């Protein structure tokens, strides 16, 4: 796009290169896909040419992924103090149709494995990347995970070697191999997550941030998927959840559980909602949060 | 960070009975932290196969309240470690206090870096199990030393696992409540019956793995028995690789010479006033009593003390 | 007691928001209420002409929360008085923070400022408006702010401002002619230095002397009301002003600053931790839309407050939480009332409601769009060619707030030039590039406010000591750009096409004239369209086809060149009638003649 | 100085030396100052801001730094060490480690050298040797005499209990030793262009520095090892043949030193090195600096 009387840093050349490509891919080919990874905020990379955009379906939520990122290296003693960088991604989580990206650039160079960014020892960092994963899936944007990222891999990726399949026999790598399966399965068949437009999430709570947790809500139409995260290992009892819908609630998935190799803390299946005010809310649903773990909710049907 | 700034606190206290998790030999998937206490050490070095047993390849970083720790990348369970303090000009090689396995060199004693992951069988024992309730029930004691009881051969002793259903029966068969073993912590020499003691946080070789006597207990619980562990506070054993003069200087020992002379054991006995030595005793206690869920532990002298 | 139990309470609460009603002078018919903040101070007395001005006649009592307290018998409305607090060893004379009115002994504000106790007695006969009053509903109309500074607005003699009282009539008159909706005035709050603008305040609570009393700045608002128009105040708490005898140290130590040396505009920020600080601050943003029935309150230089170097990191909480605990307050207490700030970081939800992680504010000044379009028509025709993309691109950012156009007094001042000043070519040309803007102006999304006399083109920047240059509304062109600025405005007011500002109210036709400088967009609301076509170059355009959704005939309904606006009069009939085939992937399309720099804006027929 | 210059200060600086020296003739004003302004140690009549000396600033970063590297990879960094000296004579300087070094989690002198216990003493004692070698006067804060482990809290006194054990009373001893030096012999006391020669500085793989500090007659010749290794049959060239004698060993074992160590009685070879007549053959110590004099 850029080049470093006219005076003009943008190559614009490029910039019309670009829109006549991504123009002639979906004339040809309809249902093709077109990504583009920006590093600039130049607008309107996902957006159609005949708005001035460049013309792609989707953009790379590289954001998302660099502050996501700084956030989880901190240890969860920190974590108070950085919060609105956990909070302050989905400000511009709908400007772009976007992916959230987790590839090679950041497994490699000395930036060290995604296991290895985690804080704290190794059921700690099994957790937080239990966690990491759990919100990125419930984060709005479509998902994207490099080779190796599925099971926590120690090394960082090296093209002159094959990845260390060998610690699949560890149970915590094949826990989050398990994890991201459970993860994908949900994400498959639960419609709430497939709309990453403003519609599809509302904020539950935001402002916990002695214990650095997040509540927040995802939905399309009737069907909604209530996400909770604990990142701090401190586990939290009898943390009440403002919700919109009384009544049973289930629990859909539990990042704690121990088929993922976590403390097996967690609410046993059925929650019930308590008919009283929380969060601005109607019900609240009075939960417990696992240590670094994601727990995914839903009303019963 | 393996050590909280918080849990340096503790230790300055003496309140960290659960100092065993920071302290000895710890396995992770890529190496293993080491954590040693060496208050008056100028250099804590831990020497092993994993290292080409050199002092400088992996030296130990000093924390709060003389406490070191450090990182081994590549130390590995089953491995055998030593660690090299260096007090001013003098350097000498120590066992490790906290180790939870140590196995002799010469098979006739060397700390080993141990897991002791271990899946218990004894839930409903434990919630039966009366405690100070238990005075107003029958206890009959049994008092055992594993090595005298029963034999396979002349001179050949039975393993924590063989002597279970063997003992656990004839304990039954009489209707005692508990077994009293005589100390299992490690100890050199087998004549002093266990008496004077140079791992207390592992279990003697010469019947097993920490995790055959795990599964002994696991099996006594199971079949209804308890079992009451002999314990030495009172007093540590004489060898020097072990506890004496740990940091190249009095440690475990009184500092002032006054103290230190005692009938019976001299400079050998605890000195109480040091909350180090606390933390050491009392995270045994526990130590004993959580990760082997022994239902009693025997003072021995406590006149002595 | 003076103080209720439940009061002091609320003030160790922080909630104090009625604080005025107990805080500062208070008159009855045998004497004035006397209540002052000072939590550090060893002792508290009134000094005044009612007393000797003798330091032991009335000392006030220690309350609870550091509230000090005192009745004195025959203090009466239009005395002075003075607050003698006492730091342990030291002694030292402040005014009233809470000072309903503030007034020069010597008749120089930068020499002297003292406190006048005053009664607020003020009938409103405003009762149509404010019934009629809608704030954050405002999203979905017309919004068009005229700036003010009044005492350099107009004069009623060379170097003597107008009266609050005498300005009402003229400043209504003229708002009307122009067809603005709300009036923006510069700091109102009392200020010792008159080229301060009003932005270092030392009497929140007081209106400035120089206008009048109290009373007559109610007059004013309560006139303009009548007369259909709205009143936004600026107000600052940003910082306060740097005056011994102001807030700076109040009891000897930091009160309203930070009480630690390293955090701390240098040192004479809020502490917004303190309980006391966010009362005083939020008490006086409801103060002003309470007793002076001010309909919108804008907040300057919010970057100054949500960062501290403009693990706890650059961001200061304490700040984002007032702010939005600030707006909240306000939207509770008037749900009608209207929040502006002005961000030059890109802070993402300034315009957010607070239940969202915003600020809480209503509106966001669009200075991007402001520094982008300026930057733009400053350069050369034959070269805005060259950067095409400034004007397009504007856009890509147009909604991510609720925005405001930002045309304000900053950018005509310090050597920024005037608006006319700074665009370019010969006088024909400026008049035609400054009526372009507008047109630009009012057809891209976002509210639109103008400083005074950017309305006639004005020559020379703001100069605060003298009124603006009047003379100028003889000379043709400059009453052009008035009749156009009004015309847009009429315009603005009545097609509601041009009320919503969402992506919803906004269709591109075409952008990629880089050539010719020519750009061709639609505002839309439900079937009413308005179409823009606007040439950035002198060349007229002949046989220039746009294309358009709708077919028939097409009526032109303003025209930058027209010589009312004293323009070259290059004009369509005003009957045009569209071509069925396509142009800019549309069924339709209109074939225009572009007049030079101009702007035509037009509508389908019913 | 700024606020783009502020004349008013300027003015003010300048009168301000002018008018002490001339009411005390032999006062001594300096001044830190953090830019690269020319000329404050130089005098108000040639527009310099008049003081007598300011602290290097510069040294004490590109020093510290240096050190707080490992000796593994003090290698890649051997210009910051060597480069001081294109800097150390444009004004009349004192060398500086002062409290601001030492607070708001910069960590004390000793707690920034790398390495176990030894070689951080080993570090601060070289340290030091090559800042009383390097030309400008010399400033030590309070606790650095020592090495003392915790950085400077106002709030109570210092780590005197420290001076009881070995390697911080060696740093004191190696501190006293390096001020009697210091006065002693004059080619110390000359921080001119003059004073300096270079013997080697290209010697970046083994991290070596050698040098000449003189005065008329008198030499002082400083070596320097900046890695653990001991250094066997390394030769430095020399102006004079003759006897040399090693005045101050860092690495005795007086200061905690290992001991290796030339011990005086060291003869010079007639074969040229480092473009220079003669050549001592000499250990380098661990870490160590070593100085030497022609013997007399």
């Not at chain 2, 009975?17 to 190496?31: F, I, N, T, V």
């Not at chain 2, 196995?103 to 141990?114: D, K, R, W």
């Not at chain 3, 101070?41 to 001005?53: E, H, P, T």
Request: proline residues 7%; hydrophobic residues 35%.
């Amino acid at each position: 796009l850029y080049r470093d009387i006219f005076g003009g840093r943008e190559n614009l050349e490029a910039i019309d290169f670009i829109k006549k490509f991504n123009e002639t891919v979906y004339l040809h080919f309809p249902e093709a896909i077109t990504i583009a990874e920006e590093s600039t905020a130049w607008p309107g990379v996902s957006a159609p040419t005949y708005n001035n955009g460049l013309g792609f379906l989707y953009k790379w939520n590289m954001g998302w992924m660099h502050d996501t990122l700084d956030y989880m290296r901190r240890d969860p003693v920190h974590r108070k103090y950085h919060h609105d960088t956990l909070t302050f991604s989905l400000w511009y989580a709908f400007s772009e149709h976007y992916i959230l990206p987790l590839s090679h650039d950041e497994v490699v160079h000395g930036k060290g494995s995604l296991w290895t960014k985690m804080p704290g020892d190794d059921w700690q960092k099994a957790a937080n990347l239990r966690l990491l994963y759990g919100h990125m899936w419930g984060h709005p944007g479509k998902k994207l995970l490099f080779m190796g990222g599925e099971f926590g891999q120690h090394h960082e990726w090296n093209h002159d070697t094959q990845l260390e399949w060998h610690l699949l026999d560890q149970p915590y790598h094949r826990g989050i191999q398990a994890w991201v399966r459970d993860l994908n399965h949900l994400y498959r068949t639960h419609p709430a997550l497939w709309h990453d437009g403003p519609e599809g999430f509302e904020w539950i709570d935001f402002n916990d941030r002695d214990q650095s947790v997040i509540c927040y809500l995802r939905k399309h139409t009737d069907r909604l998927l209530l996400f909770v995260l604990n990142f701090t290992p401190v586990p939290r009892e009898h943390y009440r959840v403002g919700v919109p819908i009384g009544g049973p609630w289930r629990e859909v998935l539990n990042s704690d559980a121990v088929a993922y190799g976590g403390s097996g803390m967690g609410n046993f299946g059925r929650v019930e909602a308590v008919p009283e005010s929380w969060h601005g809310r109607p019900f609240h649903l009075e939960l417990t949060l696992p240590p670094l773990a994601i727990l995914i909710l839903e009303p019963e049907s | 960070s393996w050590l909280t700034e918080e849990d340096i606190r503790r230790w300055e206290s003496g309140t960290f009975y659960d100092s065993y998790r920071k302290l000895g030999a710890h396995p992770d998937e890529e190496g293993t932290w080491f954590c040693v206490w060496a208050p008056h050490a100028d250099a804590v070095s831990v020497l092993g196969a994993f290292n080409n047993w050199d002092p400088e390849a992996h030296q130990l970083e000093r924390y709060g309240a003389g406490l070191w720790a450090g990182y081994v990348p590549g130390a590995l369970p089953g491995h055998a470690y030593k660690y090299r303090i260096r007090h001013g000009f003098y350097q000498a090689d120590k066992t490790d206090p906290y180790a939870f396995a140590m196995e002799p060199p010469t098979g006739s004693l060397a700390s080993i870096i141990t897991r002791l992951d271990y899946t218990w069988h004894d839930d409903a024992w434990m919630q039966r199990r009366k405690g100070p309730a238990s005075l107003y029930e029958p206890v009959s004691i049994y008092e055992v030393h594993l090595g005298s009881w029963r034999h396979k051969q002349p001179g050949v002793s039975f393993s924590y696992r063989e002597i279970a259903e063997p003992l656990a029966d004839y304990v039954q068969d009489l209707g005692f409540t508990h077994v009293e073993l005589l100390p299992i912590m490690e100890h050199p020499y087998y004549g002093s019956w266990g008496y004077q003691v140079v791992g207390y946080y592992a279990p003697t070789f010469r019947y097993g793995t920490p995790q055959d006597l795990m599964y002994l207990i696991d099996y006594l619980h199971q079949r209804g028995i308890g079992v009451i562990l002999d314990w030495v506070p009172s007093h540590f054993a004489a060898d020097p690789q072990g506890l004496v003069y740990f940091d190249g200087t009095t440690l475990f020992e009184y500092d002032d010479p006054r103290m230190r002379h005692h009938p019976d054991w001299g400079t050998y006995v605890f000195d109480y006033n040091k909350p180090g030595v606390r933390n050491f005793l009392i995270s045994n206690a526990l130590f004993w009593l959580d990760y082997y869920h022994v239902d009693g532990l025997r003072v021995d002298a406590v006149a002595s003390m | 007691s003076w103080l209720t139990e439940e009061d002091i309470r609320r003030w160790e609460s922080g909630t104090f928001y009625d604080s005025y009603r107990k805080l500062g002078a208070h008159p009855d018919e045998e004497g004035t209420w006397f209540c002052v903040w000072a939590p550090h101070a060893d002792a508290v007395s009134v000094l005044g002409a009612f007393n000797n001005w003798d330091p032991e006649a009335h000392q006030l009592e220690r309350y609870g929360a550091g509230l000090w307290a005192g009745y004195v018998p025959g203090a009466l409305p239009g005395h002075a008085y003075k607050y003698r607090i006492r730091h342990g060893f030291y002694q030292a004379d402040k005014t009233d923070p809470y000072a309903f009115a503030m007034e020069p002994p010597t008749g120089s504000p930068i020499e002297g400022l003292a406190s006048i106790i005053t009664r607020l007695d003020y009938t409103w006969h405003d009762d149509a408006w404010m019934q009629r009053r809608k704030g954050p509903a405002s999203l979905y109309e017309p919004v068009s702010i005229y700036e003010v500074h009044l005492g350099s607005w107009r004069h009623k003699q060379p170097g003597v401002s107008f009266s609050y009282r005498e300005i009402a009539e003229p400043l209504a008159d003229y708002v009307q002619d122009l067809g603005f909706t709300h009036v923006e005035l510069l700091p109102i709050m009392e200020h010792p230095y008159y080229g301060s603008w009003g932005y270092q305040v030392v009497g929140y609570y007081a209106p400035t002397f120089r206008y009048g009393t109290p009373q007559d700045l109610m007059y004013l608002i309560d006139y303009l009301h009548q007369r259909g128009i709205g009143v936004i105040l600026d107000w600052v708490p940003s910082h306060f002003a740097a005056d011994p005898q102001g807030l700076v140290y109040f009891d000897g130590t930091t009160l309203f600053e930070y009480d630690d040396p390293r955090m701390r505009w240098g040192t004479y920020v809020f502490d917004y931790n303190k309980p006391g600080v966010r009362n005083f601050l939020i008490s006086n943003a409801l103060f002003w839309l309470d007793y002076y029935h001010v309909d919108g309150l804008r907040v300057d230089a919010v970057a100054s407050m949500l960062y501290r170097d403009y693990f706890g990191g650059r961001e200061n909480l304490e700040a984002i939480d007032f702010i939005k605990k600030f707006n909240e307050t306000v939207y509770l207490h008037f749900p009608e009332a209207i929040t502006i700030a002005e961000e030059s970081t890109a802070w993402p939800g300034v315009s957010a409601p607070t239940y969202n992680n915003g600020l809480g504010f209503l509106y966001k000044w669009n200075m991007g769009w402001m520094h982008d379009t300026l930057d733009y028509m400053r350069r050369d025709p034959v070269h805005r060619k060259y950067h095409h993309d400034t004007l397009t691109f504007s856009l890509w950012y147009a909604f991510s707030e609720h925005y405001i156009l930002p045309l304000s007094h900053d950018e005509v001042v310090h050597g920024k030039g005037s608006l006319w000043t700074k665009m370019p070519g010969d006088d024909w040309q400026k008049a035609a590039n400054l009526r372009l803007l507008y047109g630009h102006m009012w057809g891209h999304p976002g509210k639109k406010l103008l400083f005074m006399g950017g309305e006639f083109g004005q020559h020379h920047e703001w100069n605060h000591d003298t009124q603006l240059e009047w003379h100028l509304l003889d000379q043709p062109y400059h009453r052009g750009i008035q009749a156009w600025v009004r015309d847009l405005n009429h315009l603005y007011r009545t097609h509601p096409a041009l009320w919503h500002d969402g992506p919803e109210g906004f269709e591109w036709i075409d952008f990629n004239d880089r050539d010719q400088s020519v750009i061709c967009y639609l505002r839309k609301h439900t079937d009413r369209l308005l179409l823009f076509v606007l040439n950035f170059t002198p060349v007229p355009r002949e046989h220039y086809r746009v294309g358009v959704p709708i077919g028939g005939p097409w009526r032109e309904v303003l025209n930058s060149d027209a010589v009312a606006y004293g323009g070259s009069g290059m004009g369509n009939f005003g009957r045009v009638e569209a071509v069925p085939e396509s142009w800019h992937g549309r069924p339709f399309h209109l074939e225009l003649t572009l007049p030079p720099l101009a702007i035509l804006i037009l509508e389908p027929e019913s």
